[PDB]
Design an enzyme around this catalytic site. Structure first.
Site, PDB file in Angstrom:
ATOM      1  N   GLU F  59       0.779  -0.653   0.061  1.00 54.38           N
ATOM      2  CA  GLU F  59       0.141  -0.004   0.250  1.00 54.38           C
ATOM      3  C   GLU F  59       0.756   1.080   0.032  1.00 54.38           C
ATOM      4  O   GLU F  59       2.290   1.298   0.880  1.00 54.38           O
ATOM      5  CB  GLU F  59      -0.865   0.224   1.412  1.00 54.38           C
ATOM      6  CG  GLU F  59      -1.367   1.405   1.189  1.00 54.38           C
ATOM      7  CD  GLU F  59      -2.014   1.157   3.027  1.00 54.38           C
ATOM      8  OE1 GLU F  59      -0.804   0.699   4.287  1.00 54.38           O
ATOM      9  OE2 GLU F  59      -3.168   1.691   3.250  1.00 54.38           O
ATOM     10  N   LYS F 134     -10.064  -0.298   0.448  1.00 50.32           N
ATOM     11  CA  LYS F 134     -10.092  -0.393   2.295  1.00 50.32           C
ATOM     12  C   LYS F 134     -10.962  -0.005   2.640  1.00 50.32           C
ATOM     13  O   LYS F 134     -11.459   1.254   3.251  1.00 50.32           O
ATOM     14  CB  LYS F 134      -8.485   0.337   2.609  1.00 50.32           C
ATOM     15  CG  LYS F 134      -8.214   0.304   4.340  1.00 50.32           C
ATOM     16  CD  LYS F 134      -6.834   1.193   4.055  1.00 50.32           C
ATOM     17  CE  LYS F 134      -6.012   0.868   5.152  1.00 50.32           C
ATOM     18  NZ  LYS F 134      -5.034   1.413   5.370  1.00 50.32           N
ATOM     19  N   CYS F 166      -4.037  -2.778   4.978  1.00 51.05           N
ATOM     20  CA  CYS F 166      -2.891  -2.867   5.961  1.00 51.05           C
ATOM     21  C   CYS F 166      -3.409  -3.010   7.276  1.00 51.05           C
ATOM     22  O   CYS F 166      -3.949  -4.064   8.051  1.00 51.05           O
ATOM     23  CB  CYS F 166      -2.407  -0.994   5.621  1.00 51.05           C
ATOM     24  SG  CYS F 166      -1.221  -0.395   7.207  1.00 51.05           S
TER      25      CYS F 166
END
Lengths: 340, 340, 340, 340, 340, 340
Positions: F59, F134, F166
């Site tokens: 990312e 995300k 993440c």
């Protein structure tokens, strides 16, 4: 005493340590330029770590190691001075305390005696509140004039702080001295070169445990033309457990929250491993049960410390018998270090 | 300083350490029976480790921990006495030196004062050549009378040996005191109960490093009705690297060869990490370069040690401010330990 | 065999290994420029490590990997040649021996056959005293011409040295061959790319143990446009325990002292794990007790080695049955590598 | 090649290894009683591990180590014999293959020559399908007559199995010999006593990697009057990664599934680390590119193996120069082992 | 949240976990006898750990695993019952809370339906304040009737406690469910057999982190005729760092202090890793900056949980497609488990 | 599921993950230039890893973190767009699939709402086959608009792939959601900044285990002016064991082969740790034995998930009681985040 978040609370001091890449510098202008890079780094880090109350940079992070004697003298800093003012402005702007390194700091007799190797603690108002000079320079290679004093200073949120430098930390006496002065955090700033990587990682943890104290280590990284520095900056709890630790990476950062109430609660209520208390009240249970009062024994039972304090020359003579009589060895000679 | 073989040479002392399973005993007859089990173990181990010159058993390995006060007094040993004679016979038969534990050893004022917690070093001729009494009993739980002295004794092949016990090893001062008396091996015998497993593993290694000394640790194992003991008996090099280490297993053994010439060569020729030398010659390079002679600085720069030696009562008062004023805490009271 | 100091003694060889950042080069002029950077690094390192007697750089540290075939041929070195002279001058100036990599070294039939992948050992007088050509190139990717010979050379302080390269070290036979020729230190220089990081760390240690030999590994670091190299340069004792090890950091350095007397004492007096001795005296105790003389059994009991030596084509045929018959696989084809 | 479940599939062999507590036995009746305890353990384990296809017990798990020579001869087993029949019945009842240890197995010239140290592989029908005699007894202490042959046998689900014993595994040659005969699993059964714990853990993993083979290790535990055994029974993948590993605990068990298709797919299609293939096709890319055919080089380039095969007495003489000339050393004498 | 001492304070809950050796029992009288051994152990441990407020024993520590169905039914406990009364008396005498295991607990329809696998939390007044029945029995082997509910109970010093059992902990959902009910400590009691040792060590730590919760694990040890249990009882901080951990040793103990104020301070003030908060306020910064209010997004974005809650039969059908349709597999059949 | 080679077979997907050095960029032109550097890296890596079928970048690896709001909006990407076309060309040229990061991706209401944080999976024909936004931005610092959906896509050789980003990976629910949709590989791309290094390493492994899924993690490295990123990109097996892992080094790479047949065989035939199956068939053995059918229990027993799905506002209210009611805290205020 907790790790993983970027926040901090009224109870916790948010501490950041920096694996700062070792500079390779030669001139005063270069040192100033690097000081401003450190300042920029402090301000940027605060944007990412809103809990940050204390930021710690390695020994030599400002000047690098000035291998050239002429350059060493030409770049020796005044404290306070231009470098510290640059750092102070960053501490104010980022509303954080900071620990920075001046290597060297001008001797009182500059330039006719070796500079000191020095740390400053600067508060969030930009004021220098502690100045520490390395008591144990890393001889034979390091030519700094030795300092003679440890200090404790009220830090962010009232956390009591002592500073020590690199080679100092190999000697358990200095950590003891700081903790017994009331230190709750011992900050070890270093430019600790390979070989002794694993030994230094272990020492910091062992000293956190032995002295029931928080420990923060900032160590340099990279290769500077002479040494490669192994990083592993860390924050360690008073129970000897690592909070967070860096690897060997250039400009790694670690960040942890250290609780003010936890260390004070521990120092009050811990029993079997309250080392600071127990050292000065030995065998209290035995004396009570033997009808001899309720304080244990305070007297120092170790002849080495009695001799060192009373007759340092005798202690030196004793150790030379076990090791060697001259500072150098003819089996591995070093220019300027006498032997034989 | 090498690990993996069962042999030893004229240069190396073959050291075995034993994860001895903690006894749960109550009577003198039971103690004697267990002493003979230890003796049988020494003789058997020698059959398997022909290089063995020194065998080390844990603190409490002879009596276990005598939790009952009456049993404690009834089983307190004379030294020399029956238990030591049993051990001495095994050392002679197996042609090895040995370290054994007497817990307790009768006080001079037995049975009106608490016994000592004691180690003996017995040579291969069955002679007791060192008797050490624990300087730092593990208060509050341990009620032993504190000892007051460290010793160094010429051991197998001339290897210089000091003994310390369990809680002693949490305090860097004792390791320093032994090494500064000339110790080349510090033997830490312990009945070190959980919780503090990782901290104790780390301490032994850190102390080997800090004092440039071989370290051997024998720790008890098993559950004895009160505590579980975590083993991790170990032999560690003077460079801080483990030679061999046990796990938590009952009656685990480790064995390593420690070189006499290597430690003496190191203590003579090491420079950057010759800690014993450097502590008493601080900043030698700086002083030379500053025109101030070639010995560095010997004087003790640490106020804590100066105060402790001069005015132990002041040092005690100082530490009580940082911790607590009474040996007990009302937040975790213990019968017989005053607080509040 | 000790770690942590920067010194060395008459008994110890001070060995430095370098996590040298992998170059990305294309021309002879660029190679020369990088050779001079290596030379500058040798001289600087010696200023920081006064005990240094041997410095080791990774395979490919001079040229990087010449992926382009035309550039490979254009930059192939003569030995001795300009690159080696540059290295030799640094060894003389820094009074150290050095191990350097020439990739490639011109084939006898240059430029009509693939260059060799070559290491040189240069002494402190600047003389090339060993030249080793990689016996096991890292096929399929590596196109170097395979070498055919291992060497042992008297090194600093009389320490006996053999050189091997990267992929060579996956094959226990080469380490055995060197140790059985009398090697006391095997130096493995590599540009060992990820993936196989943990496997390579383990291999070096296992080979140190199996062959009762010191091992030094220098491995490249960084990303070079194709591979990322995992570092973990290391020095390992003959008892299989790491002395010092780098991480994955660019231009990391490790440094350790290897004792000449310790390895010779071990090879003479070790018994249960004297592997070099025991391999050629199998079951000596059994034969003695069975009335069959006191030398054990020397004869090779392993059919694979008998077959390989007598009939390499048969051994090859045997292994193709277990693996595959062609050097390439149609499931993962590579241009220039036949399959199917 | 996967770990964590108790199942197995048509593709996987479910392998269990046992940290069997070392027996302390003296008579044939005691050995039989212990053999039946092992049998009971096999049947119980199968109830908990329904995927189990292979169960592995340590060297000495049947007899323990018979230190007494008279007892050694009195308890030496016939194979097949009573002990193996007891094991065979358990394998049938639990529908599993098993590896068991007979220490000793009667010599052909029993009782006038030392017994062998022997392993059997028994299939799920109770048939002995491999009998291996230890080629490298653990001299000086072990007095077993050395064996001379390795074997490969089709095992459960067609998985190809070789057996080796304890000290054998220190010598990379034996693992190579087995894998080159086609072994897909090498089973190392041991009573591996401390000191060499970490070295043995590392060796098994390194050999799995070097020979692209599954490895299963069963090691004894506990103290037997002479030695303490360190456990760490393990199953390891052909890529050198541990599947599951025990600690030092008495009667620990590990269990893993090894895929038949995965090892065969790897041996066919792996390239850079297809060590079995690459050893006999060295520098194939280089030779192709040099116009010299597409097979690489098969010839053995290692003089040690050429000499050992051709002239074992010369190889022995060579190694005695590097080590010592007699099987014993006067610096650490052992009764019955000549020196000086 | 600190480790190493035997004390506790008004702020900390002193938690002990026990690596209890797995019993091999068959009758009600044997179970009672073992319950009294556990009681004796609680009282003894308190003598050594004066800070102890909570003591935790493994799943199956009272009965062992009743492999025999008839014995299972004959030894199934009433709660409250005789076993719990025995435990309650120890909790009162030692002034500690305790977690104990009843395997089985009689089903409402005993003996016509399978017993439950049950934990009780008993307070320092001997009162049962939580009774938890295992929601995820370790099928296929475990035949216990599944429970259906998690609980949270105010524990010592107000610390909020939930209990879970063994296999339960493999499923992150249960830890989430407890923490979201307000649990500050999740106690995982287990008889976790090899193979899955490392996976279970990792799971407990990962769940402590993911749910910002203290975790205590008590796991059985030893071999019980069928399984070997791997120990590694542990106490873990809410920041995912182990406080103390046992090895595989029989009757190992760990002990740590968990701070009430620290977890509450963290749950209030942590930001980036306040997982409990953040899961129900997703993307708050983004929504604020996008003009959409200051709460982030609460809605569950994960179809699996929506489907499972609404249509469990559909979720089951979905997972059978990815795995298998029957509870058993014909490739590894188990009596009583249908397949094919 | 094997590690160490550069090849791949018809059974294995060769996965490379990249420790990509975090860019410090400000303009669209700079982003494009860096996208082309990534493209060049893909093509070079394929030359060294001929088995590579999937390459994964962190990312933020394309844009870095756009701290400046104006720059954030100016550099927000269209998907498909110029950056993705650059990546697509590299995937085609190198015949590999790739995972790339667009931070930000323009919101539907750009520039009046915050951009998304987005991953694309591009196949070997250059086609975007998955686009993931995300779901859990790393608030408070991250200002991205949250996404709402997970996806599964048929990947190279039919391997089923889901992408997550993440902070997402701290929440076990997302990994569960992907695996229950049929994912066989979950790819976690991250710019995961220190402090939480060890926690993130552990999370990936624990999630691989809990969901019986391959996991690949690519994490950024270096210092970007604000954060230092800790690397440790990794590929992990479905049994929770790491295949290969990077350190903290800039532009480290790991590479492993994941077997399609192994995961499918496991999901079919695993029993005790078939977590996906067992979660929806709880207590099957117990129900069978209790006469209640052969499917176990599917119903969700966890109130948190029932409440969250039915009444997210209630779940939010519940969690605010345990944590805090406002997204910010006055003890650590952040501009734009309300508190108090």
């Amino acid at each position: 005493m907790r790790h993983g978040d970027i926040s901090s609370s009224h109870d916790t001091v948010g501490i950041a340590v920096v694996n700062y890449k070792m500079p390779r510098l030669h001139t005063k202008a270069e040192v100033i330029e690097n000081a401003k890079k450190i300042a920029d780094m402090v301000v940027g880090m605060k944007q990412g770590l809103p809990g940050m109350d204390l930021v710690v940079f390695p020994e030599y992070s400002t000047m690098g190691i000035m291998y050239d004697q002429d350059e060493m003298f030409a770049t020796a800093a005044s404290i306070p001075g231009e470098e510290t003012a640059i750092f102070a402005e960053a501490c104010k702007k980022a509303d954080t305390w900071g620990v920075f390194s001046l290597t060297g700091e001008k001797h009182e007799d500059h330039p006719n005696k070796a500079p000191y190797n020095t740390l400053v603690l600067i508060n969030n108002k930009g004021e220098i509140v502690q100045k520490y000079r390395k008591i144990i320079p890393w001889c034979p290679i390091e030519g700094w004039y030795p300092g003679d004093t440890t200090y404790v200073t009220e830090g962010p949120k009232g956390l009591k702080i002592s500073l020590i430098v690199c080679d100092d930390g190999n000697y358990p006496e200095i950590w003891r001295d700081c903790a017994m002065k009331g230190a709750e955090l011992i900050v070890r700033c270093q430019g600790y070169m390979y070989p002794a990587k694993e030994q230094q990682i272990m020492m910091a943890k062992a000293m956190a445990w032995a002295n029931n104290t928080y420990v923060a280590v900032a160590n340099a990284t990279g290769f500077d033309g002479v040494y490669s520095y192994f990083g592993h900056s860390a924050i360690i709890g008073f129970d000897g457990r690592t909070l967070g630790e860096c690897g060997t990476e250039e400009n790694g950062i670690q960040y942890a929250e250290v609780s003010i109430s936890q260390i004070r609660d521990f120092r009050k209520n811990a029993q079997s491993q309250n080392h600071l208390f127990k050292l000065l009240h030995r065998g209290y249970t035995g004396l009570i049960n033997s009808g001899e009062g309720d304080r244990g024994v305070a007297e120092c039972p170790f002849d080495f410390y009695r001799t060192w304090v009373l007759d340092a020359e005798k202690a030196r003579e004793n150790v030379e018998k076990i090791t060697r009589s001259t500072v150098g060895t003819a089996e591995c000679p070093i220019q300027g270090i006498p032997n034989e």
